[PDB]
Amino acid sequence: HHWGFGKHNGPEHWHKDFPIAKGERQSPVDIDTHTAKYDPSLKPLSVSYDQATSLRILNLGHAFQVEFDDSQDKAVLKGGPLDGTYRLIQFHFHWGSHDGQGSEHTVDKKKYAAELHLVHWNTKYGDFGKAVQQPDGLAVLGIFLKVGSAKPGLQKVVDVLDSIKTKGKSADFTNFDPRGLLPESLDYWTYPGSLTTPPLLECVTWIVLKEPISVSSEQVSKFRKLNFNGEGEPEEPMVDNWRPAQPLKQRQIKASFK
Ligand SMILES: [Zn+2]
C-alpha cells in the first residue's frame, strides 16, 4: 500500500505514513485573491534556463519527471522572494481525468487542467537530498495549464510519452529547453509550503505564476494515456495525480501585483 492516487492509498490516507500531511506549512493551497497581499517590495523573478541540460524522462509511477544535470551552475532560479540561488533538478506535472480539474493550486477555487512544477534546490546545501531537510531548501515554480492553442515547447514531452507508458520505463530526453514551458509574464504569488507528494517535507518557497500557459487538448490528453501500473499489470490510466488544496493556516500569500 505504497502511497499513490487510488481510492485506498490517495491523499486522504497519506497522513498515516507521513503525519506532516496535517502540518502547518502544507501545499498546495487555494489562492484567495482578495486575501493575498500585494507587496510592492517583491522583485522580479530571475529564471535562467539557457544552459539547462536535460538528461532523461522517467515514469515514476504516480507521474513522469524530466531530470536535469544540476552540476550546471547556470540553470538557476533566483530573485523574486528568494535570498539564494536554486538549481533546476527536475520538472513534472499534475493533471486530471478531464480538462476541468488537474491543478494542485487553485485561484479563487478555480481548477486548471494541469500544473507544471519546476523544482530547484538551494545552492547553500550541497545537493537535493540535503536541501529538503531545510526550511528554505527548495524553490518550486508552479505554472497552470489551460486548454487552447498548442504550446510548441511542450511537444517534445508530449511526443515521448507513448514510449514510457508504464511505471519504471524511461527514455533519453536530451536537448530539451525548459524556457519553452514559460508564459510571457513572470508575475507571481508566493508563500512558504511543502512538497505535494510524500514525504511532504516543509522545505519549499512556492512561486506560482499568475499567467497560465496554453496547451492544446491533444497535448494534455496524451498525459492521460500514461499508466500508474507496471508492464504486464492491469491497466490503470495515470489521471488525477493532484493533491487537493490544504489549509493555509498561519501563512500569508503575497503577490507581485494587485
Ligand atoms: Zn509537483
- H or E element at residue 217: helix 217-223
Alpha carbon of 116 to ligand 1 centroid (Å): 7
User: Running DSSP on this structure, what letter comes out for residue 242?
Assistant: -
How far apart CA 147 and CA 134 sit, in angstroms, is 36
How big is the chain, counted in residues? 258
94 annotated binding-site participant: yes
196 annotated binding-site participant: yes
- With a CB cutoff of 8 Å and minimum separation 6, the contacts of 128 are 70, 89, 121
User: Running DSSP on this structure, what letter comes out for residue 237?
Assistant: B
The label of the residue with cell 527548495 reads: 138
User: Running DSSP on this structure, what letter comes out for residue 230?
Assistant: P
- With a CB cutoff of 8 Å and minimum separation 6, the contacts of 18 are 3, 198, 199, 200
Q: In this structure, are residues 56 and 170 in contact, taking their beta carbons and an 8 Å threshold? A: yes
How far apart CA 167 and CA 135 sit, in angstroms, is 31
Amino acid code (one letter) for 33: T
Alpha carbon of 92 to ligand 1 centroid (Å): 6
Q: Tally the C-alpha atoms within 13 A of residue 37's C-alpha that lie toward its C-beta.
A: 8
* Experimental method, per PDB record: X-ray
CA distances from 120 to 69, 205, 206 (A): 12, 10, 11
Q: Tally the C-alpha atoms within 13 A of residue 101's C-alpha that lie toward its C-beta.
A: 10
How far apart CA 112 and CA 95 sit, in angstroms, is 9
The count of other CB atoms within 10 Å of the CB of residue 9 is 16
The label of the residue with cell 530547484 reads: 120
Determine the 3-state secondary structure of 200 from DSSP.
coil
Q: Per DSSP, which regions of 21-137 are E strands? A: 30-31, 37-38, 45-48, 54-59, 64-68, 76-79, 86-95, 106-107, 114-122
Q: At residue 251, what are phi and psi to the nearest 5 degrees?
A: -75, 155
- Please name which of 196, 189, 178 lies closest in space to residue 66, comparing C-alpha atoms: 178
User: Of residues 1, 8, 15, 62, which has the active-site annotation?
Assistant: 62
Alpha carbon of 196 to ligand 1 centroid (Å): 6
Beta bridge partners of 114: 95, 145
Q: Are strands 138-147 and 114-122 parallel, antiparallel or unpaired?
A: antiparallel
The count of other CB atoms within 10 Å of the CB of residue 22 is 12
How far apart CA 25 and CA 246 sit, in angstroms, is 9
Q: At residue 223, what are phi and psi to the nearest 5 degrees?
A: -55, -35
How far apart CA 59 and CA 62 sit, in angstroms, is 8
Amino acid code (one letter) for 174: T
User: Domains plus CATH for the chain?
Assistant: 1-258 (3.10.200.10)
Beta bridge partners of 46: 78
Q: How far apart are the first and last CA of the chain?
A: 44
Alpha carbon of 104 to ligand 1 centroid (Å): 8
197 annotated binding-site participant: yes
How far apart CA 256 and CA 258 sit, in angstroms, is 7
How far apart CA 165 and CA 180 sit, in angstroms, is 23
The count of other CB atoms within 10 Å of the CB of residue 148 is 13
Q: Known catalytic residue: 34?
A: no
Q: Per DSSP, which regions of the chain are E strands? A: 30-31, 37-38, 45-48, 54-59, 64-68, 76-79, 86-95, 106-107, 114-122, 138-147, 170-172, 188-193, 204-209, 213-215, 254-255
Q: In this structure, are residues 173 and 57 in contact, taking their beta carbons and an 8 Å threshold? A: yes
How far, rounded to the nearest angstrom, does the alpha carbon of residue 190 sit from its chain's CA centroid? 14
Alpha carbon of 71 to ligand 1 centroid (Å): 22
